[PDB]
Nucleic acid binder design. Structure first.
Lengths: 70, 83
DNA sequence: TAATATTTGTACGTATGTATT
DNA sequence: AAATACATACGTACAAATATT
């Protein structure tokens, strides 16, 4: 099957920006609001995707600052 | 004398942890202390909600972090277990 | 065997707090 | 000082997998 939950598709796409070198280490990804409107999903879904990627070390978050390629 | 677990409140400096972090600390203290063994089931999310006096969201954040650490694993419809 | 209940998973809603810009 | 941005945390509903009856 080809189906993945929405947070997993957001994870895959963000991961693809990294890997592919479109976002370099210590560069900022789009804001939560920006990702929400880009994927047409809730803030919770974005935060789940980002939280997963942070847990596996792909990203880090700075409160009030942004989220960045690690 | 069984039932239920306190966690320190906070609207009121540097002794403080967020609720999900306190729940993480307690659950991980059950492991380590051998109160729960590998492949033994921890309480359900609803039991944890009632016993820590927090939302399902907070319980799921705590457990999610601990699974991410490799301390616990989940089977949906089954339960959550000590790794 | 079939149906129902339980339990975790996904997705979203809303409010408020805190750090950075 | 105000606005922006991530963090914490309360809630809802329904899906999917497992357990129970």
């Amino acid at each position: 099957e080809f189906m993945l939950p929405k947070y997993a598709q957001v994870k895959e796409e963000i991961s693809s920006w990294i890997n592919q070198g479109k976002i370099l280490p210590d560069q900022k990804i789009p804001t939560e609001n920006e990702l929400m409107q880009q994927f047409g999903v809730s803030r919770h879904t974005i935060r789940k995707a980002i939280g997963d990627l942070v847990s596996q070390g792909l990203l880090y978050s700075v409160q009030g600052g942004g989220t960045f390629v690690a």
